[PDB]
Write a protein that holds these residues in place. Sequence first.
Motif, mmCIF file in Angstrom:
data_model
loop_
_atom_site.group_PDB
_atom_site.id
_atom_site.type_symbol
_atom_site.label_atom_id
_atom_site.label_comp_id
_atom_site.label_asym_id
_atom_site.label_seq_id
_atom_site.Cartn_x
_atom_site.Cartn_y
_atom_site.Cartn_z
ATOM 1 N N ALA B 31 -49.256 11.876 -33.964
ATOM 2 C CA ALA B 31 -50.413 13.158 -33.247
ATOM 3 C C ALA B 31 -50.093 14.145 -33.474
ATOM 4 C CB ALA B 31 -50.344 12.487 -31.565
ATOM 5 N N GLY B 32 -49.927 14.876 -34.443
ATOM 6 C CA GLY B 32 -49.830 15.970 -35.276
ATOM 7 C C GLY B 32 -48.902 17.000 -34.725
ATOM 8 N N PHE B 33 -47.123 15.852 -34.905
ATOM 9 C CA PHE B 33 -46.059 16.848 -33.338
ATOM 10 C C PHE B 33 -44.681 16.635 -35.264
ATOM 11 C CE2 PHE B 33 -48.250 16.619 -29.604
ATOM 12 C CZ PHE B 33 -47.789 17.717 -29.409
ATOM 13 N N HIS B 36 -37.199 17.079 -35.216
ATOM 14 C CA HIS B 36 -36.133 17.950 -35.109
ATOM 15 C C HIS B 36 -34.680 17.335 -35.095
ATOM 16 C CE1 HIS B 36 -39.127 21.469 -34.760
ATOM 17 N NE2 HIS B 36 -39.394 20.277 -33.748
ATOM 18 N N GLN B 91 -36.814 14.999 -32.346
ATOM 19 C CA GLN B 91 -37.123 15.395 -30.732
ATOM 20 C C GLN B 91 -38.707 15.258 -31.098
ATOM 21 O OE1 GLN B 91 -36.051 19.769 -31.118
ATOM 22 N NE2 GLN B 91 -35.629 18.630 -29.277
ATOM 23 N N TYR B 93 -42.946 16.460 -29.471
ATOM 24 C CA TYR B 93 -43.356 16.568 -27.832
ATOM 25 C C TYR B 93 -44.581 15.592 -27.410
ATOM 26 C CZ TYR B 93 -44.756 18.652 -24.026
ATOM 27 O OH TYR B 93 -45.141 19.703 -22.444
ATOM 28 N N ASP B 94 -43.808 14.411 -27.264
ATOM 29 C CA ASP B 94 -45.390 13.258 -26.483
ATOM 30 C C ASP B 94 -46.166 13.426 -26.025
ATOM 31 O OD1 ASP B 94 -45.357 10.596 -27.495
ATOM 32 O OD2 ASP B 94 -45.442 9.985 -24.897
ATOM 33 N N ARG B 95 -47.308 12.662 -25.277
ATOM 34 C CA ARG B 95 -47.821 13.392 -24.967
ATOM 35 C C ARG B 95 -47.760 12.652 -22.709
ATOM 36 N NH1 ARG B 95 -51.899 12.433 -28.914
ATOM 37 N NH2 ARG B 95 -52.422 10.777 -28.109
ATOM 38 N N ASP B 98 -43.047 14.771 -22.175
ATOM 39 C CA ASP B 98 -42.650 15.819 -22.870
ATOM 40 C C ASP B 98 -42.267 16.009 -23.518
ATOM 41 O OD1 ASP B 98 -45.096 15.906 -21.422
ATOM 42 O OD2 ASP B 98 -44.561 18.080 -20.403
ATOM 43 N N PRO C 201 -52.561 18.080 -30.802
ATOM 44 C CA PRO C 201 -51.598 19.077 -30.484
ATOM 45 C C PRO C 201 -50.483 19.836 -30.455
ATOM 46 C CG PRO C 201 -51.841 17.382 -33.044
ATOM 47 C CD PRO C 201 -52.776 18.257 -32.423
ATOM 48 N N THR C 203 -48.116 21.842 -26.504
ATOM 49 C CA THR C 203 -47.993 21.314 -25.405
ATOM 50 C C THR C 203 -47.879 21.221 -24.524
ATOM 51 O OG1 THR C 203 -46.578 23.549 -24.912
ATOM 52 C CG2 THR C 203 -45.016 22.229 -26.847
ATOM 53 N N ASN C 204 -47.635 20.887 -23.033
ATOM 54 C CA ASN C 204 -48.375 20.939 -22.117
ATOM 55 C C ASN C 204 -48.972 21.959 -21.261
ATOM 56 O OD1 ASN C 204 -49.186 17.315 -22.179
ATOM 57 N ND2 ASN C 204 -47.734 17.404 -21.637
ATOM 58 N N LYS C 207 -51.448 23.263 -22.839
ATOM 59 C CA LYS C 207 -53.026 23.031 -22.161
ATOM 60 C C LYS C 207 -53.420 23.082 -20.699
ATOM 61 C CE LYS C 207 -52.547 18.100 -25.118
ATOM 62 N NZ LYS C 207 -52.959 16.823 -24.702
ATOM 63 N N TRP G 46 -33.935 15.889 -22.529
ATOM 64 C CA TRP G 46 -34.849 16.916 -21.921
ATOM 65 C C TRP G 46 -34.414 16.700 -20.518
ATOM 66 C CZ3 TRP G 46 -39.485 17.453 -20.049
ATOM 67 C CH2 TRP G 46 -40.039 19.125 -19.314
ATOM 68 N N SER G 58 -42.105 22.922 -16.329
ATOM 69 C CA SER G 58 -42.494 21.190 -16.863
ATOM 70 C C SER G 58 -41.419 20.776 -16.406
ATOM 71 C CB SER G 58 -43.266 20.407 -18.170
ATOM 72 O OG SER G 58 -42.932 19.988 -18.289
ATOM 73 N N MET G 103 -46.378 26.153 -34.489
ATOM 74 C CA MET G 103 -47.844 25.757 -33.492
ATOM 75 C C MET G 103 -47.566 25.876 -32.030
ATOM 76 S SD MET G 103 -48.719 23.570 -30.894
ATOM 77 C CE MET G 103 -46.997 21.678 -31.492
ATOM 78 N N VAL G 105 -44.788 25.735 -30.735
ATOM 79 C CA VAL G 105 -43.188 23.889 -30.130
ATOM 80 C C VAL G 105 -42.066 24.834 -30.589
ATOM 81 C CG1 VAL G 105 -43.163 23.028 -32.498
ATOM 82 C CG2 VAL G 105 -42.180 21.371 -30.835
#
Lengths: 126, 110, 428, 123, 123, 61, 121, 121, 110
Positions: B31-33, B36, B91, B93-95, B98, C201, C203-204, C207, G46, G58, G103, G105
């Motif tokens: 999903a576009g992440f 690393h 690693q 950033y799964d939705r 996080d 894609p 980070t939250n 969002k 994390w 978060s 992006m 990240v």
Amino acid sequence: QVQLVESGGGVVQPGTSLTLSCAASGFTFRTYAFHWVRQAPGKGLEWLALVTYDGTTQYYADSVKGRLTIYRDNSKNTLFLHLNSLRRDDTAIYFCARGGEGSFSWLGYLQYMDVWGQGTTVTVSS
Amino acid sequence: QSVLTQPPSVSGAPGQRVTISCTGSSSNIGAGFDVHWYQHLPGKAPKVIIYENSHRPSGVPDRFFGSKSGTSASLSISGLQPEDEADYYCQSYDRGLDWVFGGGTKLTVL
Amino acid sequence: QNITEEFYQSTCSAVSKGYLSALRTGWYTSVITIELSNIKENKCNGTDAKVKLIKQELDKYKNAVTELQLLMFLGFLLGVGSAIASGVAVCKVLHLEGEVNKIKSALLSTNKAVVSLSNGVSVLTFKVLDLKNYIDKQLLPILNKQSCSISNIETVIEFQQKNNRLLEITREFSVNAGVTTPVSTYMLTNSELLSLINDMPITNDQKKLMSNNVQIVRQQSYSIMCIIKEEVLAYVVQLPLYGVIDTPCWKLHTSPLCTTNTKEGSNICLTRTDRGWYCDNAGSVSFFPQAETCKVQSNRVFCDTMNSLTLPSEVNLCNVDIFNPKYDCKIMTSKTDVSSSVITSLGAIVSCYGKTKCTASNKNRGIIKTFSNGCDYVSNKGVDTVSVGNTLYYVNKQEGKSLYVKGEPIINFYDPLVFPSDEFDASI
Amino acid sequence: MNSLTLPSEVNLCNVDIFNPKYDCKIMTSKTDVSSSVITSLGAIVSCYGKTKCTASNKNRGIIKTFSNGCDYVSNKGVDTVSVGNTLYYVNKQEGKSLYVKGEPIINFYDPLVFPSDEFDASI
Amino acid sequence: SVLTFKVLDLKNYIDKQLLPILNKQSCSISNIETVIEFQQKNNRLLEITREFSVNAGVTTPVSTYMLTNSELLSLINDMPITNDQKKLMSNNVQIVRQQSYSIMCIIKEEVLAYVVQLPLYGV
Amino acid sequence: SVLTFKVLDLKNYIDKQLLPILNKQSCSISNIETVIEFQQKNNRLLEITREFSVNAGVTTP
Amino acid sequence: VQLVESGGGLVKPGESLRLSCAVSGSMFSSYVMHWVRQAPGKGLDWVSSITGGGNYISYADSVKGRFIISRDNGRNSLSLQMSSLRVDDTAVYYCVRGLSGVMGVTWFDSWGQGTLVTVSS
Amino acid sequence: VQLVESGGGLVKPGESLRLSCAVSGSMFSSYVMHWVRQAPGKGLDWVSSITGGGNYISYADSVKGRFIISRDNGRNSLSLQMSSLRVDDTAVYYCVRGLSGVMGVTWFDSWGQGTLVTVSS
Amino acid sequence: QSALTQPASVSGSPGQSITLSCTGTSSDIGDYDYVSWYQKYPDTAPKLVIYDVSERPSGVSTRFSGSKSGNTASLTISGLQPEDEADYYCNSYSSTNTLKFGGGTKLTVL
């Protein structure tokens, strides 16, 4: 040269889901659309299913829906059905046919039976 | 518990090339992440081996080679060297969870 | 929140200390398609009264589809980039044959998906409407009967509900010719924009920020029109990404600083030609000279980094101490004496000179302050309006804490007349 | 309506900047700004001083790194260009590119005799 | 002697399909289907009225409600230009829509009309 | 003490001509003429919404 | 670019206590801050994230409000509070200064030394 | 501003041949080109038009694709091919360098010498 | 399966006229202007003889004549032939998105 020749079929066990293929040559294929029909010994013709150009709005009859899936490839232009949960009653000769002229997805324009195949014979017994 | 999976049983003698693969679900990486790779040699602080699969950081050797494809990231090392003993990570950033981290791979020499 | 500022009286300038940057740094492309089927002639007898509006409405739809078929102060140093770049690239990827067929087949039932393309680009897919089902089940079985006649008019008004959106798309792209600034709500409904926020894609926390500022991302998003072929009509939104969020970013207001020489025209003067925004992005600062590009919303600025400068991190040093041997500290200079005033976030800088009325006044007590000469400052929470000469201004009554520092007449440190007066861009 | 009826001798100055036929108007300033512009078929990078200068694409990461001076990248080798802290995307529209060798024209003169206080000038 | 064109025919619709019905003794419509097509013949004029209270007589660019695209093509086939220009303007209806302006003329004797200043293309 | 003004009266229309009808047991409208005038009393509000959604709160002109 | 932090020790579960983070960077105003932890045995994961002004906090699912993070940018420091605790939360905790991506990240660049926190028995 | 062209002669009808046009203009890139013909007896009429880059070709009703025109702008020249031929097409053919009018109407300014082409027998 | 009622067979000498018909509902061969008739010989592919109520395709005689009346499709012949021994069907678009077929009428001669 306008023709429709068939692929697949034969004698099938109950169950044992069947894959059936069309084949056509000598004309454009993507512009028009293909569709599938049958007729069984002891009765007449019975409609099954239709697709448009590419895979969109797969029409199914009420008696054929669920068991049968239908899909067209653009690579070598042969319609493929896959029918599941075969009963005793499906022994029939299945015919490809073509229909539709332009870039339409409407069943009214998709009703001209411009060419027919020779059909595959599918027989179920023991 | 980690959605990222990598075999923590990979090791070899110095000299050859070893490739490590870490894969995840569709909701991360694919999903576009970006992935690393790190290292976790005992003692001093863990630092990045490579990030987002193409940019290596400033001071690293060229043995490390990262790549990504779908939900799977690969890191290949040619000419293994003695202090490569480290726990290597992945690693994204799964939705859902996080910031996620993989199981890690313990690389050591023989 | 915690808006504060420090008007330096050394050089007439305001710094808007305390803000969060939320800067765009890239585009995220997305394709939006509306499926639709080609309608032939009416195939009807007579004109009637029930089945009449179908004819004009389908002709309007035909006109729309065939029309879209026929469709396809440091600004001088500021760099120029083609903002409509990634979206037209995605359209160009779609121009290759058999590519939009992958979107057609893969997005057959799922509302949103991600497909791979022939250039390795795998951004996103989404369908906005389903005119397949409506057109081929609720319109064409009825309008194409023998001696056609509708059952009730309730059939066609929902056809309005399923056609005014497409007509809005047509009239949006017909006026602005493929590129639209900003994106109208007809090209994307706001709840669906939130759904797209929950899709790309990022980070939250991005969002959450984009959710809380859907109007901002709607304002900065673009739209480019892609192909129509095999009747799977689609376009690309080039909605902004947001790379760096939450760093201090200050607005440098500047004002004239002119010595009060009674002899007119002989009073050479100068400003800091540094008006704009400075956000501390990475190990440098992004500088935005054109204030019209940047948008403000409740302590949150939003400014596109395509028109910025990657100025070095040593900028607060010149901002506090103007005479430093570390930064160039650019200067506007001219002997022209203009009475003028500017408004910062938390007050007003007056710079009236010579024979000019200078007043800060509020509706409670009437006039409250008179400025004799020199540039002066008024806090926003003591006054509503400021009058300079013959013109008025209203200050922002947004709540915040102010501090006015003591400065000095910097231009009086030099000789009264050795300065040049013939340059826009300069430095100390 | 907003144009100039400029004489037909403009390609002469366009190719050969030092010609005794056209005025060849000049912007000048001592200010050193890292910046980049986008043409139809590539990107002109003009970053100066300590500034990251990269032409990179999503296929294989970075593909070019610029030391100093203005340089150029063709559009059909790269998707994005990064200068300093900002990114730009190049037009992917298909076309043929040719990069000619030039020279540092400003180094033909003395380092510091130039004026620096005009927006409009000429050679 | 530039041109004339009539876009709509509210004479016939107003004096034949609205006023004979709405102005009866103890008026009552036959069916609601009469009024919705009145929406078709009044939403256009309402779009006019709503887009000129905004831009105050002069609009940049031209909206499709002042000129439908098929009718713009008809006007392309009307003005005295050469046919290759006609072909180019047909291919760039959107561009000529962008460049074209529109200024508001008189309303007197209830024959309401307005001028369009659509661009020519000489070279 | 500048000024106040009310442009529309959706109290009366919603609570007298819509909700007594739409919220019946096994609801069914009397005629479609009820809803088209609802288009007259909702297109304006939707226009307001789409004006402020495009220009993000502040609109010129 | 370095990073020193403190706050480790053996404290019983169930009580709140300070964890310091004292990065000495000059431009620690913009870069994103994360806290991670490496358990004895099981690898690192994390924990907590904080973004600049601290308005977009978060946390991982292990702590929903159990660990509350706040930075004072004026004092260029950071602090984590153990509002709620658990015996499995013993680990070596690491501050880490992440840089924003192309992006958005976090790359989790050069870390701290890591402070061991034990909550056993 | 002058104009020299060639390609004349006596050729049987029904064969493709070349008509060259070799203007020596200094800024021959922008102006519109026309080819006309004066018949023996009956006066002159327009044949073919070509516009700059050659993307808006137009022909008179006498030839629908029969006379195909192109120009090479780099070699500053015109070429006309007689794909289809008729015995009445004998005439003196003229290249004409026309300049755009206020609307774009060609004024047909200074012409060429004119080359006689005969197709009898 | 739902279909169209049709006669089983018709008895007629060569040289006479048969009027073979089928009858459906409103959501059938009734209305929609989609009446189609098809004939077929044993172990041969069926072919189009009548489409679009009364339109006749190419490569077929005009002695066939298809029409409809309300919910009843009809096909009429003139001057019967021994080669007309075949089975016939009426296919039409039924408005519940289907192509309903006929029961088969056998035209034979004695």
